[PDB]
Amino acid sequence: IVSEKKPATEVDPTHFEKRFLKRIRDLGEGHFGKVELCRYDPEGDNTGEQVAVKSLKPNHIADLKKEIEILRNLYHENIVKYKGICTENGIKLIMEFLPSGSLKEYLPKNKNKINLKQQLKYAVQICKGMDYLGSRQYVHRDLAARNVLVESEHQVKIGDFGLTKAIETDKEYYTVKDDRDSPVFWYAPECLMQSKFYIASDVWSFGVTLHELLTYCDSDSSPMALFLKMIGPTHGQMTVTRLVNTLKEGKRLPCPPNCPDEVYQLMRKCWEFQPSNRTSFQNLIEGFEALLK
Numbered sequence: 229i230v231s232e233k234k235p236a237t238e239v240d241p242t243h244f245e246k247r248f249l250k251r252i253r254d255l256g257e258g259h260f261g262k263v264e265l266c267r268y269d270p271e272g273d274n275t276g277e278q279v280a281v282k283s284l285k286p287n288h289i290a291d292l293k294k295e296i297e298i299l300r301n302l303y304h305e306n307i308v309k310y311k312g313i314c315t316e317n318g319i320k321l322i323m324e325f326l327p328s329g330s331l332k333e334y335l336p337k338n339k340n341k342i343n344l345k346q347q348l349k350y351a352v353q354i355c356k357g358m359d360y361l362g363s364r365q366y367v368h369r370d371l372a373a374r375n376v377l378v379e380s381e382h383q384v385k386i387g388d389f390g391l392t393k394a395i396e397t398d399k400e401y402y403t404v405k406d407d408r409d410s411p412v413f414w415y416a417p418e419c420l421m422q423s424k425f426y427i428a429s430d431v432w433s434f435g436v437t438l439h440e441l442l443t444y445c446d447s448d449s450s451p452m453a454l455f456l457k458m459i460g461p462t463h464g465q466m467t468v469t470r471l472v473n474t475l476k477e478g479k480r481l482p483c484p485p486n487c488p489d490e491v492y493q494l495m496r497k498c499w500e501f502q503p504s505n506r507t508s509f510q511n512l513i514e515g516f517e518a519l520l521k
């Protein structure tokens with residue numbers, strides 16, 4: 229009786245079996261799906277490694293697959309490490325688990341531990357990861373303090389790439405078609421007006437991320453809370469056009485409390501109305517380093 233001979237099974241370390249991936253809790257609820265803390269426990273004794281698992285809620289599978297392929301080929305100390313995948317056409321993205329979470333979770337609870345010097349070092353690391361992303365012709369489109377993971381007191385990593393798009397060679401921007409649900413209070417005017425995304429658009433979002441970092445991610449002084457005070461919080465569908473109008477008028481987020489003018493000036497260089505007039509990530513690194521020593 230016939231039976232197929234089995235060759236030597238080259239066991240894949242980036243392949244995680246669904247049966248061993250055991251859910252612990254929810255970490256976040258992103259744009260398209262969910263992120264959960266799991267323990268890959270093949271020995272079934274609660275000793276397995278803790279991993280961050282990104283999946284979809286039951287179309288948008290194409291976006292997750294493209295996000296997986298982007299992260300798989302990113303290698304930088306300030307970019308969350310890709311660990312692998314869990315296959316079914318359904319797919320799950322496995323990433324390293326950073327128990328400190330994002331700056332949004334970490335900063336309000338560790339104010340006494342993080343001084344201005346440490347805040348400027350995080351800013352340098354965010355810029356380096358962002359510059360590495362830009363050099364590989366990519367636009368992040370979701371740079372906020374909530375997407376900056378804390379590895380330790382001395383190291384941060386860009387931890388989510390759900391909205392990352394590639395900029396075509398011999399082209400300066402990407403045109404978004406699905407601009408819902410956009411983080412409008414973090415976006416540059418060209419993103420809000422014409423739905424165009426340049427590298428300079430990410431520099432604008434960095435300025436906003438830097439403002440959050442300096443305010444230790446306090447909810448009351450958040451970019452959304454502050455801009456809604458400037459434009460009005462009861463405009464509904466007229467919020468974005470009022471936001472564009474306010475930015476055109478020259479109005480920008482105020483100086484964070486206890487932030488020196490020289491840091492605020494670097495932040496202002498990120499907020500030039502025209503993308504071509506904005507500072508680069510490399511000029512920001514230079515700027516922060518100069519203030520460090």
Ligand SMILES: N[C@H]1CC[C@@H](Nc2cc[nH]c(=O)c2-c2nc3ccccc3[nH]2)CC1
Binds near residue numbers: 258328
């Ligand atoms: N705010 C979004 C950041 C991106 C995603 N989160 C990741 C991703 C990859 N690796 C991680 O370790 C985490 C992580 N989030 C945590 C939330 C609380 C505590 C620990 C956490 N770890 C979703 C939430």
